[PDB]
Amino acid sequence: GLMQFTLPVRLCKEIELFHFDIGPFENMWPGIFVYMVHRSCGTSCFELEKLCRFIMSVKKNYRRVPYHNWKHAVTVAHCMYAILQNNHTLFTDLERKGLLIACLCHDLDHRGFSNSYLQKFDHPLAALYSTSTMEQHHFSQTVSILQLEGHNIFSTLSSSEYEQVLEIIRKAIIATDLALYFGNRKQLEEMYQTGSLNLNNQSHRDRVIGLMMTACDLCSVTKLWPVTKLTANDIYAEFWAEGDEMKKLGIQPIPMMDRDKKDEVPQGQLGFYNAVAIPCYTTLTQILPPTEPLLKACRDNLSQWEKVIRGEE
């Protein structure tokens, strides 16, 4: 109860900003995450003995892959923290609780491969879940860690409060399947443009929480350029691994995943910002106007990729 986590001044101040980078020191991330649960939720939401043991089980079930790692888990949890703070009153007490856990858990036990490479490889997880293959695996993995003796952070919730929170988490986690982002955003654009959009409509919140999860999941494009540029290296380390695996199944992989086609990266970043990132954050600022900074940073990084092509860095 009477324990606070207190970060250093620079972190204390930088963490409130959308663009915050959680730094290269693995052994502070668990504390940065608690810091965010207490400031976002209450020093009450969870018992610190339970939360810590949940965090270190979650850390342990991420894998040492180039991008879909523990670092990303917590990066994506901080973007949700930033969204939750600058929209204090739009979100229920349960939703703040669920969504930060959601974010921390959203890529649990990823192996560095797309839902696509699972199906072409005929991995068992592709027989168990026909679509959002990894994302259903990640939710399953979260339900599993919550059920370890001593790990149920949600134990001090009514039967009903409990079922709501695992259902927020479930949908949140499914929504980080980029294949369900496209339809979800078209609907939300249409719903705020035609004015029908209703945040008391539970099914409409669902869509809005889904957008946030794509926004938080993609939040690596919203960072300062050096951060975004060095994160891009890690993201293509996985994509190119996957490409090599595709090639060993005797399948020419898409250019995104072909390490021969490095030359095509800047133009591939271009389409990705235009086709996915700008629309994501555009729609998200339209619906939660204090999220504007993510659109402005994303815009800025687009311009930085425009400069790489023009042959100026």
Ligand SMILES: O=C(N[C@@H]1CCN(c2ccccn2)C1)c1nc(C2CC2)ccc1Nc1cncnc1
């Ligand atoms: O970059 C992404 N996609 C584009 C799509 C065409 N493309 C090409 C195409 C040809 C050659 C080279 N690249 C690359 C991208 N994709 C995803 C999921 C969709 C899997 C998540 C993040 C991404 N970006 C990113 C992440 N973290 C920091 N910075 C950026």
Ligand SMILES: [Mg+2]
């Ligand atoms: Mg994922």
Ligand SMILES: [Zn+2]
């Ligand atoms: Zn992710």
